[PDB]
Amino acid sequence: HHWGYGKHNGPEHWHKDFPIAKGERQSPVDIDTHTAKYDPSLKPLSVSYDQATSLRILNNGHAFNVEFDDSQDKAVLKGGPLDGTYRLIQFHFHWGSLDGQGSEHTVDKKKYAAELHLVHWNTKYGDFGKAVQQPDGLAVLGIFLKVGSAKPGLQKVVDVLDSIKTKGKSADFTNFDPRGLLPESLDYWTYPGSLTTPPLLECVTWIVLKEPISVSSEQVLKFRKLNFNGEGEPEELMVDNWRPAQPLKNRQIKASFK
Ligand SMILES: NS(=O)(=O)c1cc2ccccc2o1
Numbered sequence: 322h323h324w325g326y327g328k329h330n331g332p333e334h335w336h337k338d339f340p341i342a343k344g345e346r347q348s349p350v351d352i353d354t355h356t357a358k359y360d361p362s363l364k365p366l367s368v369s370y371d372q373a374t375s376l377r378i379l380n381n382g383h384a385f386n387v388e389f390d391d392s393q394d395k396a397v398l399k400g401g402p403l404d405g406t407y408r409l410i411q412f413h414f415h416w417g418s419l420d421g422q423g424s425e426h427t428v429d430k431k432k433y434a435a436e437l438h439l440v441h442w443n444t445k446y447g448d449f450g451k452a453v454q455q456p457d458g459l460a461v462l463g464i465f466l467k468v469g470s471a472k473p474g475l476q477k478v479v480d481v482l483d484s485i486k487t488k489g490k491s492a493d494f495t496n497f498d499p500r501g502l503l504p505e506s507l508d509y510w511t512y513p514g515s516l517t518t519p520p521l522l523e524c525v526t527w528i529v530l531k532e533p534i535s536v537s538s539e540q541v542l543k544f545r546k547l548n549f550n551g552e553g554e555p556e557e558l559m560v561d562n563w564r565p566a567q568p569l570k571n572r573q574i575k576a577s578f579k
């Protein structure tokens with residue numbers, strides 16, 4: 322794998338090694354709020370994170386992942402558009418070099434400063450590697466970030482970043498409560514899509530919350546001090562690690578709210 326977000330290996334290049342990049346259910350997409358239909362059949366989401374066990378934070382060269390113990394049903398997503406139970410495996414963000422870009426989904430073409438992805442896999446397939454091969458294998462909860470007031474529950478993540486500056490570095494990250502990253506409302510849009518980094522597999526039910534969370538300038542500035550490169554290599558700041566909106570094709574975005 323030599324894909325990235327640089328000048329010569331960014332999203333417009335990915336198709337050359339991952340031809341699914343030009344598929345019919347790629348993500349992210351623009352959410353046209355006037356075209357998205359309210360679906361009175363969609364249920365409230367069930368976010369059950371009381372028992373979550375965070376373990377480690379990793380700079381993988383394209384973002385940082387906060388990893389969870391997904392060996393049992395401790396932090397799960399159910400309900401909403403989903404059948405069955407999806408276990409939280411990791412969360413990560415995508416963000417910009419400036420506040421005017423960074424999110425992957427857009428809302429009536431508006432870009433947010435960043436987007437959080439809480440990634441879950443369908444326990445009927447037993448492990449994540451099997452789940453990504455299935456059209457209903459994953460559920461990703463996407464949450465927009467705007468810059469304004471600090472997000473108190475994000476600060477513990479921000480403060481550890483200085484210890485995982487470069488690709489391949491990790492740090493123990495236990496006892497982190499991902500409930501502190503949610504907005505007040507769980508109203509959402511949903512549609513069938515894909516992973517947004519290679520392998521770009523078409524295995525995700527996307528659940529994108531309407532209400533952004535607020536983070537401070539200082540919090541997002543610390544995201545932008547991370548590096549894409551490894552230790553001692555030429556410094557490439559980890560910024561603009563987002564894929565653009567892809568064609569919606571033959572898909573409907575449904576709204577949980579009137
Ligand atoms: N198609 S790709 O995975 O994004 C990829 C782009 C690319 C550019 C230069 C060298 C290796 C590369 O690998």
Ligand SMILES: NS(=O)(=O)c1cc2ccccc2o1
Pocket residue numbers: 438440461515516517518519520521
């Ligand atoms: N950015 S995402 O769609 O949440 C995503 C999670 C994920 C895990 C493994 C490989 C690609 C991935 O892409």
Ligand SMILES: [Zn+2]
Pocket residue numbers: 413414415438517
């Ligand atoms: Zn993501």
